[PDB]
Amino acid sequence: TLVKQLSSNFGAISSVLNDILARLDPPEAEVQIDRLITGRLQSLQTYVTQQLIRAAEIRASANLAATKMSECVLGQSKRVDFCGKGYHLMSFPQSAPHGVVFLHVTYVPAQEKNFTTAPAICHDGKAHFPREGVFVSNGTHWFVTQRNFYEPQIITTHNTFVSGNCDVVIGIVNNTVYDPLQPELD
Amino acid sequence: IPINFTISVTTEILPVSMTKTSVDCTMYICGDSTECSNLLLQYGSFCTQLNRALTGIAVEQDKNTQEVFAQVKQIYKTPPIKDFGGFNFSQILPDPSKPSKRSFIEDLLFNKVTKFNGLTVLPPLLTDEMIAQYTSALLAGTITSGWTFGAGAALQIPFAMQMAYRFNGIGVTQNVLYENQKLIANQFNSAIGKIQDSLSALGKLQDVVNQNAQALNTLVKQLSSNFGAISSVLNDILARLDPPEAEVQIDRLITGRLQSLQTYVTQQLIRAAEIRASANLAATKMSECVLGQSKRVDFCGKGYHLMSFPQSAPHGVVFLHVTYVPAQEKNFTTAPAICHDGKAHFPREGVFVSNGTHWFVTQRNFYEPQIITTHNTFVSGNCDVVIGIVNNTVYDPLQPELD
Amino acid sequence: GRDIDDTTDAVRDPQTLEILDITPCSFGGVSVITPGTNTSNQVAVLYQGVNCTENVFQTRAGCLIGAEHVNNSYECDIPIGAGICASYQTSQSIIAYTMSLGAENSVAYSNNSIA
Numbered sequence: 262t263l264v265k266q267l268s269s270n271f272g273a274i275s276s277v278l279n280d281i282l283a284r285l286d287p288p289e290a291e292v293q294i295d296r297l298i299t300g301r302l303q304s305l306q307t308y309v310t311q312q313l314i315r316a317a318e319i320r321a322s323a324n325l326a327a328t329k330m331s332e333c334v335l336g337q338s339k340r341v342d343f344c345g346k347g348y349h350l351m352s353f354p355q356s357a358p359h360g361v362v363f364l365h366v367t368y369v370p371a372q373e374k375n376f377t378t379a380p381a382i383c384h385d386g387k388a389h390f391p392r393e394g395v396f397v398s399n400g401t402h403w404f405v406t407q408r409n410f411y412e413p414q415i416i417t418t419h420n421t422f423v424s425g426n427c428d429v430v431i432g433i434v435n436n437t438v439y440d441p442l443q444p445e446l447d
Numbered sequence: 448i449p450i451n452f453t454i455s456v457t458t459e460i461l462p463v464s465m466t467k468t469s470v471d472c473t474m475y476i477c478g479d480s481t482e483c484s485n486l487l488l489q490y491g492s493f494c495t496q497l498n499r500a501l502t503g504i505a506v507e508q509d510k511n512t513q514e515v516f517a518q519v520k521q522i523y524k525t526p527p528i529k530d531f532g533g534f535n536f537s538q539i540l541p542d543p544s545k546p547s548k549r550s551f552i553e554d555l556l557f558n559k560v561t562k563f564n565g566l567t568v569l570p571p572l573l574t575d576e577m578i579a580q581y582t583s584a585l586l587a588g589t590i591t592s593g594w595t596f597g598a599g600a601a602l603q604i605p606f607a608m609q610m611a612y613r614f615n616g617i618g619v620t621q622n623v624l625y626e627n628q629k630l631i632a633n634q635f636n637s638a639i640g641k642i643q644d645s646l647s648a649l650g651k652l653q654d655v656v657n658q659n660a661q662a663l664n665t666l667v668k669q670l671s672s673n674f675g676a677i678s679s680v681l682n683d684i685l686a687r688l689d690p691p692e693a694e695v696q697i698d699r700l701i702t703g704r705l706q707s708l709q710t711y712v713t714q715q716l717i718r719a720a721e722i723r724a725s726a727n728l729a730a731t732k733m734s735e736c737v738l739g740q741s742k743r744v745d746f747c748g749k750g751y752h753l754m755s756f757p758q759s760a761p762h763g764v765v766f767l768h769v770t771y772v773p774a775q776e777k778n779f780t781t782a783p784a785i786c787h788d789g790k791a792h793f794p795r796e797g798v799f800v801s802n803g804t805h806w807f808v809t810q811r812n813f814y815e816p817q818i819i820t821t822h823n824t825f826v827s828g829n830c831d832v833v834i835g836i837v838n839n840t841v842y843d844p845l846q847p848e849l850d
Numbered sequence: 851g852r853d854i855d856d857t858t859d860a861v862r863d864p865q866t867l868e869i870l871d872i873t874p875c876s877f878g879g880v881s882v883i884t885p886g887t888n889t890s891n892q893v894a895v896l897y898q899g900v901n902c903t904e905n906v907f908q909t910r911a912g913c914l915i916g917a918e919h920v921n922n923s924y925e926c927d928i929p930i931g932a933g934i935c936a937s938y939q940t941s942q943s944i945i946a947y948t949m950s951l952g953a954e955n956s957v958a959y960s961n962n963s964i965a
């Protein structure tokens with residue numbers, strides 16, 4: 262755009278200074294010279310303002326990139342959908358011409374199953390609360406497992422804790438919890 | 448230590464996009480005067496540059512909305528059964544009874560908000576129905592599938608267990624929610640009603656529309672300016688002048704109006720940069736607050752954060768934060784640690800509290816004394832290095848087994 | 851007669867002595883959508899701001915010429931405006947439709963079920 266805009270009379274006689282400085286008397290050349298100077302200065306002003314705008318935009322993007330490099334690479338981030346899609350494991354950077362390339366390694370659940378759950382469990386009239394997982398039952402008994410991986414376990418006193426009677430917690434169910442210490446008593 | 452708590456709702460509004468415009472360089476500067484166009488062609492590529500810049504702004508406008516409101520590829524619809532675990536969601540969810548697919552809050556917001564010179568205006572790519580559909584889908588997803596649908600396939604979870612997890616993420620045990628869920632439901636419903644009444648203001652939205660209107664009006668008013676010539680009407684100047692020397696007035700008018708366009712385009716670019724930065728911030732807020740729980744302080748609302756709620760607005764988006772805040776206070780005596788038999792003890796996660804009658808351990812955000820066991824604490828080192836400590840026994844649940 | 855812009859829009863004829871209205875007649879802009887030089891050559895012109903007065907298909911974004919209108923839903927490929935997207939699907943020709951949004955599926959959501 263600049264080099265094209267150089268060659269344009271801007272309402273003057275021609276585009277060549279030498280031609281202007283030859284055809285006309287020097288006291289008469291100043292009008293054409295002034296017109297050309299004004300036109301070229303205006304064009305340069307336009308170009309520089311536009312370039313300044315784009316440089317500001319690129320600087321903003323670069324600070325974004327620096328933040329992403331600082332967070333994703335140098336350890337994990339709980340910020341969901343910030344260091345990739347889904348849960349985040351790590352990230353590996355790469356150098357590309359006038360830029361960077363990130364490789365986010367992620368975790369995604371694949372397939373699931375229907376299950377029957379309940380908020381809390383009643384064993385001795387006093388309630389029990391799971392410490393890290395959920396109460397699920399496929400039909401036979403109740404089981405505790407992590408939040409996002411099916412690892413059924415036998416409910417134990419070391420898996421839950423008591424907080425009061427079962428007369429206020431809605432949705433509780435009747436079942437039993439096995440104590441590993443009782444058989445050891447003999 | 449707190450003894451009671453209230454659940455609140457707070458609001459914050461962010462602009463997303465402006466009204467795209469488009470001004471033809473040549474047709475604005477000169478009307479039907481063909482020779483006015485011819486003299487302009489001497490100056491070169493100014494018109495092309497301006498046209499390209501405005502088209503770039505126009506496309507970036509739709510880019511913003513595409514970025515901030517397109518996070519789900521599965522349009523999740525709320526099941527017909529309402530009253531999710533005792534919470535009344537009737538003002539936010541779009542009622543099928545209403546012809547327009549908005550709901551009460553959307554309608555209130557949308558009602559609350561207020562070409563021969565080339566002032567062409569183009570419509571956006573997405574209709575208000577589309578953005579309403581996005582809002583409904585996101586709301587249903589985050590109200591039925593918890594947070595585990597922005598990371599993969601949606602998984603149905605009862606609302607009670609969802610909030611129970613959300614408490615577990617802030618530093619309180621699951622007991623509090625299930626013990627007082629009717630109270631929390633009543634408080635949440637009251638808060639929603641209060642915020643509904645409050646809007647019945649939008650200081651960050653009427654500003655940008657007024658800005659654009661002022662700029663466009665200044666452009667249009669600039670036409671009547673003579674700019675140091677005989678008159679202002681191109682046709683009038685044409686009739687009373689001669690082509691051999693008409694160049695003076697026409698040239699002066701060209702220069703003046705071109706300079707005006709330069710100023711206007713620079714202002715529009717600056718405003719576009721600001722708006723796009725705001726939209727990027729809004730997108731980050733959508734990714735963090737909505738599809739998850741963020742531990743960053745006073746970012747997803749004020750105070751401890753639980754869960755957010757998005758909405759729709761004219762040229763903007765309205766967020767609803769649901770936080771959790773301590774209510775009452777009660778002083779207590781503390782001790783850095785407790786010594787039992789010459790062995791130092793430290794609490795596992797809570798803190799030692801002495802009513803004066805005895806000693807108890809409770810978490811940091813909801814008073815709930817417990818008998819000091821060996822499972823709520825652990826031992827390490829002697830008691831002769833800690834600055835402050837008190838003498839008190841530690842119960843052992845192994846004693847009843849000794850019968 | 852003037853307007854908010856102080857521009858002539860109403861005149862009195864010295865002969866008939868009547869109120870005459872003036873309305874703009876210069877208007878229009880051209881947008882051309884193509885499926886690509888490599889693919890085919892059929893094109894569908896678009897006019898930005900004119901009523902369908904001058905196979906037509908009127909939309910709020912203007913008057914469209916040279917495209918078949920269908921109710922069949924499809925994922926949006928190229929934009930025009932007001933939720934209308936064009937494509938090169940069937941032989942093959944230029945078609946227009948309301949924008950589609952993925953697929954619809956609710957969730958089970960039993961008040962005592964988990965996944």
Ligand SMILES: *[C@@H]1O[C@H](CO)[C@@H](O[C@@H]2O[C@H](CO)[C@@H](O)[C@H](O)[C@H]2NC(C)=O)[C@H](O)[C@H]1NC(C)=O
Nearest residue numbers: 450451452453454627630631633634637774775
């Ligand atoms: C925490 O504060 C709430 C809000 O006041 C209390 O809930 C009130 O309890 C009284 C006492 O029964 C009732 O009469 C009110 O109807 C309840 N609601 C309101 C809005 O006042 C709650 O009791 C407080 N917590 C404790 C442990 O007292």
Ligand SMILES: *[C@@H]1O[C@H](CO)[C@@H](O)[C@H](O)[C@H]1NC(C)=O
Nearest residue numbers: 398399400401402404413414
């Ligand atoms: C699932 O149910 C079957 C029969 O009802 C039972 O044998 C099995 O133990 C159950 N699953 C687990 C993990 O216990």
Ligand SMILES: *[C@@H]1O[C@H](CO)[C@@H](O)[C@H](O)[C@H]1NC(C)=O
Nearest residue numbers: 380431432433532960961962
């Ligand atoms: C779930 O809904 C059914 C529908 O009537 C009801 O009978 C049942 O008590 C509900 N369960 C809980 C835990 O609210």
Ligand SMILES: *[C@@H]1O[C@H](CO)[C@@H](O)[C@H](O)[C@H]1NC(C)=O
Nearest residue numbers: 383386427432433434435436
């Ligand atoms: C659980 O058992 C107790 C004691 O027999 C009984 O009172 C209560 O109704 C039972 N509840 C359920 C849900 O089985």
Ligand SMILES: *[C@@H]1O[C@H](CO)[C@@H](O)[C@H](O)[C@H]1NC(C)=O
Nearest residue numbers: 529530531534535536537538
């Ligand atoms: C929610 O509150 C509104 C307010 O009047 C009421 O009309 C509606 O029936 C309530 N819904 C439920 C499920 O309680």
Ligand SMILES: *[C@@H]1O[C@H](CO)[C@@H](O)[C@H](O)[C@H]1NC(C)=O
Nearest residue numbers: 776777778779780801802803
């Ligand atoms: C803090 O509460 C205790 C209750 O034991 C009270 O004695 C004390 O005066 C309170 N502190 C102040 C500054 O009032």
Ligand SMILES: *[C@@H]1O[C@H](CO)[C@@H](O)[C@H](O)[C@H]1NC(C)=O
Nearest residue numbers: 781782783833834835836837
């Ligand atoms: C606490 O402050 C009081 C006030 O002077 C002082 O007498 C006491 O020794 C201090 N104890 C500790 C453990 O800092």
Ligand SMILES: *[C@@H]1O[C@H](CO)[C@@H](O)[C@H](O)[C@H]1NC(C)=O
Nearest residue numbers: 786787789830836837838839
């Ligand atoms: C705790 O008891 C021991 C045992 O007599 C004693 O030496 C120590 O001074 C006591 N700590 C106090 C009084 O703070």
Ligand SMILES: *[C@@H]1O[C@H](CO)[C@@H](O)[C@H](O)[C@H]1NC(C)=O
Nearest residue numbers: 862863864865866867868869
């Ligand atoms: C002037 O106007 C009158 C009334 O409109 C008409 O009768 C007459 O012919 C006109 N004469 C001229 C010279 O325009």
Ligand SMILES: *[C@@H]1O[C@H](CO)[C@@H](O)[C@H](O)[C@H]1NC(C)=O
Nearest residue numbers: 885886887888889890891938
């Ligand atoms: C056109 O596209 C096809 C497949 O997309 C490709 O095989 C072919 O080389 C392309 N031709 C040209 C001229 O681009």
Ligand SMILES: *[C@@H]1O[C@H](CO)[C@@H](O)[C@H](O)[C@H]1NC(C)=O
Nearest residue numbers: 900901902903908909910912
């Ligand atoms: C186009 O003109 C016809 C004829 O008056 C009119 O019925 C129709 O509403 C117009 N359409 C638009 C979009 O202005």
